[PDB]
Amino acid sequence: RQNFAKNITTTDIPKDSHHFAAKRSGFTQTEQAPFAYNDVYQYPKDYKPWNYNYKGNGVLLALFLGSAFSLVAYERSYASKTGRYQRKVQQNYYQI
Amino acid sequence: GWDRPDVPLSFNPLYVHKRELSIFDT
Amino acid sequence: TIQEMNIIYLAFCWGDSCAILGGILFSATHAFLSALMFFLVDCIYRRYHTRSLVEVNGILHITPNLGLSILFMLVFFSGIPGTIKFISEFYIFSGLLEASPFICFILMLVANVLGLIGFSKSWFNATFGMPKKNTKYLPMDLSFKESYIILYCFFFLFIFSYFSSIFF
Amino acid sequence: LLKFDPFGFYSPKLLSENRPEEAMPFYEDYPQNDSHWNLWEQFPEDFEDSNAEREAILKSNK
Amino acid sequence: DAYYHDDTHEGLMNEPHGYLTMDDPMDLRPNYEKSALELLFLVSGGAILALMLG
Amino acid sequence: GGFQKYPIPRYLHVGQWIVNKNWKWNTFHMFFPTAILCFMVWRNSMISTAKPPNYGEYVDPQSPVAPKAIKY
């Protein structure tokens, strides 16, 4: 089964220690002993489980930069194929 | 008017097999 | 897999003619499609502890993503235009029509009607229905790994049709 | 199905996955996703991990 | 209709809910399958854009 | 008219009686960008659009636009 360590040190696990409280007085001779650990996971507010909850611009920036590079590279390649240092834009372009 | 209880689970009655599923009827 | 492999092999029965291009494209599309289908079967077997139609039913209503993957896998297997599967079918059947039109008709009829219906019956019956049995043990859904594997298979099957036509 | 909620978003999830019962050992619940594509444990850069207890005890012993 | 119940008062009208996938939002495992597949997708797209498009 | 409403599990991502509070802004942010995408597609495609001559126009057979047969 899983053998990884739960207690990570990269960050502190979010938790709430007030939802569950351990009894510490008024016990009976038939009642079981209480539980030592009673912390529950607490999700950050505004977290929506039904979507990626992604708020970064890295992917969009990477895709846009790739598209811009593709455009400029195609321009240079077309110039090279035409045997010119740069595109020679015509005065009029027709449908085709 | 009446406060009806939630939709019954009997709306989808579980089917219990009582006959062999012959391979010839695959 | 047997059907697709036999079609691919038939594509190589004319020496080094143009049938080799269709054979290669069909080999690629069959590889990806078989990977997709076997991965879907793997997910079904791993989350529902069975890969039999009698024991598995109504996958869609408990694992909507898995049911959607099954339905789109069936659509791709049907050979819809816009897919390398359709392109390979077009190559092979276009050649076979001139090679032996009646044989081409028989092959197309059988494979794309009778075999397609047999294939779709089981998958539709599994995907649809009502999973009333063993409610305590039902799974949740596909994971990110499985979802992205399925999406990549679909993306390749769709976009490889834009590969350079010089070699095809 | 209504009760089923392995994650703690809707029904609170204990950090201790389960409540151990008497006459049974305390084992973690099997996770919903059992993928084994896990790296070795990651630690913060320049993490301090010197054996401070051993060093202090050795210093006291002299 | 005769006895329609408003959404604000109907206790069985559902707001968007559910988990998108089976992955645990709060998982301590350094799992990398999702990262590997995302990298595969991104590199494939970048190769198409920078080597094939145009 | 419709069937009686029944509870749906929270964990399950399904569309049974799903209503979104922010649907107005969701529609706003899903409509206009789609319109821009389709405007881009339309203007790209118009470059390869063909139309027959107008009411008062005739095609000169010797003009370049007139169809030309293959020359062996």
Add this chain to the structure above:
Amino acid sequence: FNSILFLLFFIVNLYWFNSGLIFFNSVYKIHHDAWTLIFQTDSILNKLKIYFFLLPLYISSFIHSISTWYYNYILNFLLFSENLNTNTNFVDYITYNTLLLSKFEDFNLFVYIKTLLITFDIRQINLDFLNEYPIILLTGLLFLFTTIFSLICLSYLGLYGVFILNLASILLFWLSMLYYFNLIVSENYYYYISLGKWMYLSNGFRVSFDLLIDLTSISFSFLTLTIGVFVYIYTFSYFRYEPLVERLILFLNSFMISMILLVSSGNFIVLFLGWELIGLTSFFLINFWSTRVGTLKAAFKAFSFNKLSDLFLFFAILIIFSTTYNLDILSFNNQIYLYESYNIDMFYWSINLIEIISFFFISCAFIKSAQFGAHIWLPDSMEAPVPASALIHSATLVSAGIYLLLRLSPLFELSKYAYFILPLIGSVTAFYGGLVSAFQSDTKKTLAYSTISHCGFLMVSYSTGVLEFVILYLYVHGFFKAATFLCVGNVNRFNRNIQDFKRMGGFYKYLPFECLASFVCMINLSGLPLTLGFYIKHLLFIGLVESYTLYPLIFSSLILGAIAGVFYSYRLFYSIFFDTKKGKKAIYLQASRIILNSKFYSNTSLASNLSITFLVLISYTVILYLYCTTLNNYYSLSDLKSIYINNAYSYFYKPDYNFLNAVSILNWFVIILLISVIYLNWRWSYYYTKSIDSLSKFILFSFFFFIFSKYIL
């Protein structure tokens, strides 16, 4: 650090820069090449004066030089290409470009800003531009992407969000289609658009994704979209309070867009794609009730038939491609006559190429149009919700064969098999469907069999060979079938999903709007005298050909099918609304409670009523427009791209006494059948004797009225 101060300084700098630009432009116009003599004069005083008075120009030039240097460096880094034109050092390059001011020779800040602002002005768009470049593609893409993204993001778009988004998209699409409908139908406007090179289909072939917006395409597209708009508006009420309304709405939108793509297909590949898409989406609509496996059986039946049709269509396309190395629809239409003389060597028979291709096309068309033998799936397809059933059965799923025949008419004009098969099968289907619908007891089944009969009539009309008559029949049938389907859907929803009218009775008061709407829709649909739907059958009988070997059977079946409409219309209308109360007591009691009496009281939806009313009005208007375009003395329809003339219009313009009296036979048959369904008593009643007396009164009064009208005046 004040915003007001920053804005004031920026405005002052803008004014100073504009003045400097104007001054420099004038000085350059006067000193085309000699301007440097004064600008860069060696005098320190003059140099300082120029720099101070053109500081905004100099700083702008410096910024431009820095930006150009950095951009050139970026390009060189990315492309491993050349240098910055030359290998000039940074200092030399920047100094030279900053000192050079000729870059501003033709630049004016105010003019540039005005150009930028007017670039987005919406006053410039003109009807000339719209005619030159169609926005139908733009609006169709809007609808398609709206549907796709709404399907993907269901959580973001709740019920209301999905409804509003798709409503806006579909309304824009329908308005654009309406604008272009007038031009395409009458002004002879058609477009051939291409999106790109879709796929490679041979060693050096590559088929482009092209769309053809012609009269044939638009006739189906506008009808489907107009019906779909109101079906969409009606669905939100029919599926009211249902767990899955967004799913049904999105399925309907998907099917609509699939059919639009099929009809407006530029080549056989796109046509096949649309065929498969409509098949799959119809399967989904039929199997909407995914939980039940009984519905899955009907869905699988329809799927099997659709796959058989796909096989036939694919084989026909393969034959066409093998014969002609082209998949363009226009090229095939204009080339098929050359290859008409060719034959194909099959297993042991030399089959005619045209005959085999037309055989496969007609087989697929019959399968998808639910002709006799292949119609078995249509009655089972009624398991779908009423909006989906109306959409599939009105103009979307069951008209695919008609569209195929109309689009590839030049092929079938030279087809012996088509000539023999279309009339016989059409007439047999017409008779069968009409009689089965007349004897039917369920509303949806009755409408399905009526649809089968109308498909048979459409096939017979196409055999007659008047594409205008075929289009008119298609439009009338689609509009009124959709309206009747919506009405019966409201009736069924009121009756609690019981579609049989044996449990329906006295619903006229509980559904007042439905009663009158159904009356109008049914009198129009079922060919009845003095109704908009009489002319379609009149033209069909005008154009019916008589050289068929099986003409006796064909004509008898046509007559029986035509008369069968009256029985089913009367039964449906009377039993649903004005018959004795046969339904369960609860249906009436739950609605008859006095507490419900209010200004808001209704058993249906106001939106549903408005949608039905608007659909009926628009259908009337469009049918009148088509009738004026075609049947008027001045023929104003656009070119049909067909060279086959049937001479059928001769009997519509100058009919002879023989035909004029022959039509009277059918007219009087219908009259007698109406009298039968009205005055015939099947159950004892207090009004038996008085009904017989009323019949006698009517007979005698009709005789005397005719006498006075004709002779005594």
Add this chain to the structure above:
Amino acid sequence: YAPQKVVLRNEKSGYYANPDDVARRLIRLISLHDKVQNPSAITLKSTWSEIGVDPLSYVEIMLEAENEFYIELADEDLERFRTVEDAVEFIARNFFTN
């Protein structure tokens, strides 16, 4: 709107319809019959034979009860019914849409 917290099925009371109204309507239907003589003597604990419903009249009364209540009763359930109490209990607990 349903709360984000987990909510379970709430079986308020086994009756999906007002049992008192169901019983009163059934008793009125029974009294409508010709064989029935004294409506007052009819009670939920009164057997069909003692109230005067013959075995053959019982099926007619049950068919009309099905028509009145908008449901269909299986022959097994009708035979299992032994008193008006059982009949009204089954009808009230029956989900009209199954």
Add this chain to the structure above:
Amino acid sequence: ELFLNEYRKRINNEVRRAAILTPTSSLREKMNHKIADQILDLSSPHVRGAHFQAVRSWTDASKIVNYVEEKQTKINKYGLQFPLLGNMTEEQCASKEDEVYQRLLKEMQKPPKKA
């Protein structure tokens, strides 16, 4: 083989252009010309559209290769194959430019062909 298929594709495209530009009236009258004859002459026996193999004798293959070589020679006369259907160095390109310039000058100076 690809070039013959390209001829067929080009004639099909020209037929599509004719259909779109010209109304159905007179369309067949104008098509009953060079265009229809070429369409028929580019049928399957002469061009391998989608068939697996073009059944050609060795003589037919030699003729097709000779036709391709004739087209190549015509192109190379004016050196139109530098970026497409060819690769050359800078010196080769300059020499070819000079050769083509001289050839064009000589052709222009040549007098018109009689009859």
Add this chain to the structure above:
Amino acid sequence: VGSLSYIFYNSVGGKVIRDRIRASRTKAQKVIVLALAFVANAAALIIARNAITAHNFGWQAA
């Protein structure tokens, strides 16, 4: 380098854990985490594109 950096930076845990770790992450650390993988992959792809693109040809004229 890009692949390994991306894996190690985006394979620390679940969505919530990764988001919190990146929030606690310093400005420069976030910048490197976002930019290293992209820059490495982009440089590799650009170097690949350069070879096929023969821009350094001396015939560029006219």
Add this chain to the structure above:
Amino acid sequence: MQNAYPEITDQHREFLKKQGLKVYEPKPLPDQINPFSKTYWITNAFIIGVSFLARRHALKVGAPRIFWSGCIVGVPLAAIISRGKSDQLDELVGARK
């Protein structure tokens, strides 16, 4: 390539011109449709800026933004496709190369 339709005379052309007919002539792409146009690039820049602003607003209000991202990414892609289509020597129905 050679003329396929039968030839007509210049006198016949003059007669048609006097009758009032016009010779069909393909028209250049308008500034909006032309991909090598300052108007086209101004439109692209405006689209990019508005898309960035609307994406920020959608992120703030918790609304989908992948569509604005798609617009931003596809503006260069649409430009690439349009420019390639214009550059290709493919003669669809229109002006001959």
